[PDB]
C-alpha cells in the first residue's frame, strides 16, 4: 500500500458558542506546564465526566472506521459526539491544530490531521480524542483495523494495546513513575518492536499537558514517585520499524522515516489510594 500524502483539510468545524472554550483557543500558545500534579477531589470528579465523554467519542469515531471513509469523517463524528455532550474538542485551536481529534493512519506515528485521505482495505488508524468540560480534560486514543488487515499489523495493534494495559496495571501510589516505561519497553522488545521516545504521556487536569512527563521507555534516572490524586496519560507509540521520523510541513503529522507502520493506545489514569482507576472508559 502506497505511503501516505496530505489530503485536503475541510473548513473549521463550529462548536456551540455556549460550550466553554479552553483558554488557549485562538492563541499561539497555551497557559500550561506548571500545574499541580495531584488534583483536588473536585477536579478528579470532573475528570471522570470528561474522561467518559472522550471515551464515548472515541468509540463512536472508531465504529466509522472502514475502507472507504476519510479521516475527515472520523473527525466529524467525534466532534459531533463531543459537542452533543457539551464538551469542547480540546485539540481544536490548540497551538493552531485545525481539527477536533488526531487520525494517524499506518506510518503516521501520531498527530495526523483529519483530511480527505481515504482509508483502504488493510489499513490501521489511530483516533485520539480529547474532551474539555467542567474546566478539565479527558484524553484517550486507540488504533482500529480497517478491513482485512495483515497479520503483522493486527499483532502490532494487539500487542500495543496489551503493553498499555500492562503499564496501567502497575500504577500505584509509592511506585516509581519509571516503572511504566520499563514495563512497556520490555514487552515491546519481546516482539522486536521499538518504542517511540520523543513523544510521551503527560499529566492532565485543568490543563491539557500540565508539565508532568510520562516516558514509555526504560529511563530509571527519573525519580518521580506516584502519589494518590495524580492524573496522567499512558499513551505508548510502538513502531515495527526504526524510530527515525519526519514531521510534515503542516507542522503536526509525524511519519516514520522507513514508512513501516506504527500503533498507539492511550488512557487517562488516576492514581488512587491503593492503585489505579482508568477514567477514559464508557
- Specify binding-site residues: 111, 128, 139, 202, 209, 235, 266
Query: Which string of x and - marks every residue 5-44 that binds Co ion (by CB under 5 A)?
Result: ----------------------------------------
Torsion of CA 185, 191, 194, 195, to 10 degrees: -30
Question: By CB under 5 A, how many residues form the interface with Co ion?
Answer: 6
Task: Tell which one of 75, 115, 123, 128 touches Co ion (CB under 5 A).
Answer: 128
Spatial distance between the Cα atoms of 83 and 131, rounded to a whole number of angstroms: 9
Q: How far is the CB of 193 from ligand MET (least distance, A)?
A: 20
Question: By CB under 5 A, how many residues form the interface with K ion?
Answer: 4
Name the maximum alpha-carbon separation found in the chain.
Answer: 49
Contact 15, 88 (CB under 8 A): yes
**239 lies in the binding site for K ion (CB under 5 A):** no
- Annotated binding-site members for substrate: 111, 209
User: Cα–Cα distances in Å, from 226 out to 75, 103, 138, 178, 278?
Assistant: 34, 31, 19, 9, 15
| Residue 104 contact among Co ion, ligand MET, K ion, none, beta carbon within 5 to 8 Å by kind | K ion
Nearer to ligand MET, 88 or 149 (CB): 88
Q: Which residue has the cell 500545574?
A: 35
Return the half-sphere exposure (C-beta side, CA atoms, 13 A cut-off) of residue 266: 30
**Closest C-alpha to 86, from 36, 6, 15:** 15
Task: Tell which one of 97, 132, 144, 265 touches ligand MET (CB under 6 A).
Answer: 97
Spatial distance between the Cα atoms of 132 and 20, rounded to a whole number of angstroms: 8
Query: Which string of x and - marks every residue 207-246 that binds ligand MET (by CB under 6 A)?
Result: --------------------------x-x-----------
Looking at residues 44 to 83 of the shown chain, list those that interact with ligand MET (rule: CB under 6 A).
none
Query: Which string of x and - marks every residue 131-150 that binds ligand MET (by CB under 6 A)?
Result: --------x-----------
Amino acid at each position: 500500500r502506497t505511503a501516505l500524502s496530505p489530503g485536503v483539510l475541510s473548513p473549521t468545524r463550529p462548536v456551540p458558542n455556549w460550550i466553554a472554550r479552553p483558554e488557549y483557543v485562538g492563541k499561539p500558545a497555551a497557559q500550561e506546564g506548571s500545574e499541580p500534579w495531584v488534583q483536588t477531589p473536585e477536579v478528579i470528579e470532573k475528570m471522570r465526566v470528561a474522561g467518559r465523554i472522550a471515551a464515548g467519542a472515541l468509540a463512536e469515531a472508531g465504529k466509522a472506521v472502514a475502507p472507504g471513509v476519510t479521516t475527515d469523517e472520523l473527525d466529524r463524528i467525534a466532534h459531533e459526539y463531543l459537542v452533543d455532550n457539551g464538551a469542547y474538542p480540546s485539540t481544536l485551536g490548540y497551538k493552531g491544530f485545525p481539527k477536533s481529534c488526531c487520525t494517524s493512519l499506518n506510518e503516521v506515528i501520531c498527530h495526523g490531521i483529519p483530511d480527505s485521505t481515504v482509508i483502504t482495505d488493510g489499513d490501521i488508524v489511530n483516533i485520539d480524542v480529547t474532551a474539555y468540560i467542567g474546566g478539565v480534560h479527558g484524553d484517550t486514543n486507540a488504533t482500529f483495523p480497517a478491513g482485512d488487515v495483515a497479520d503483522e499489523h493486527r499483532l502490532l495493534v494487539d500487542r500495543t494495546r496489551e503493553a498499555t494495559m500492562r503499564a496501567i496495571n502497575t500504577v500505584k501510589p509509592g511506585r516509581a513513575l519509571s516503572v511504566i516505561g520499563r514495563v512497556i519497553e520490555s514487552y515491546a522488545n519481546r516482539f522486536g518492536y521499538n518504542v517511540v521516545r520523543d513523544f510521551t504521556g503527560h499529566g492532565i487536569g485543568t490543563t491539557f499537558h500540565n508539565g508532568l512527563v510520562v516516558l514509555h521507555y526504560d529511563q530509571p534516572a527519573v525519580e518521580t514517585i506516584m502519589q494518590p490524586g495524580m492524573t496522567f496519560t499512558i499513551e505508548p507509540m510502538i513502531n515495527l520499524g526504526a524510530l527515525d521520523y519526519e514531521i510534515w510541513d503542516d507542522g503536526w503529522t509525524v511519519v516514520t522515516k522507513d514508512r513501516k507502520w506504527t500503533a498507539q493506545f492511550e488512557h487517562t489514569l488516576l492514581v488512587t489510594d491503593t492503585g489505579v482507576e482508568i477514567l477514559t472508559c464508557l
